[PDB]
Amino acid sequence: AVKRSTRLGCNDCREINYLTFKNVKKNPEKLALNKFCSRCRKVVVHKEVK
């Protein structure tokens, strides 16, 4: 199988809270979305984590 999955982690508590998909070949730039955080209990920026 192919591995197009990627992990999205918070930028305040540095916790990984999301699992998404990304095409490294097509999309070259790191994701910088904003999602809900269970720890901070608010919306905060989640970035791609290795």
> What is the binding site for other proteins (CB under 8 A)?
5, 19, 21
Number of residues that bind Zn ion (CB under 5 A): 6
Q: Residue 45 pairs with which residues in a beta bridge?
A: 34
Give me the residue label for tokens 């540095």: 14
Closest residue to Zn ion, Cβ-based?
Answer: 10
Task: Please provide the distance, in angstroms rounded to a whole number, between the alpha carbons at the two ends of the chain.
Answer: 19
For residue 45, the tally of other CB atoms under 10 A from its CB is 13
Token digits of residue 49 = 């984590």
Minimal distance, residue 19 CB to other proteins, in Å? 6
Among 4, 13, 16, 33, binds Zn ion (CB under 5 A): 13
Interface ranges with Zn ion (CB under 5 A): 10, 12-13, 37, 39-40
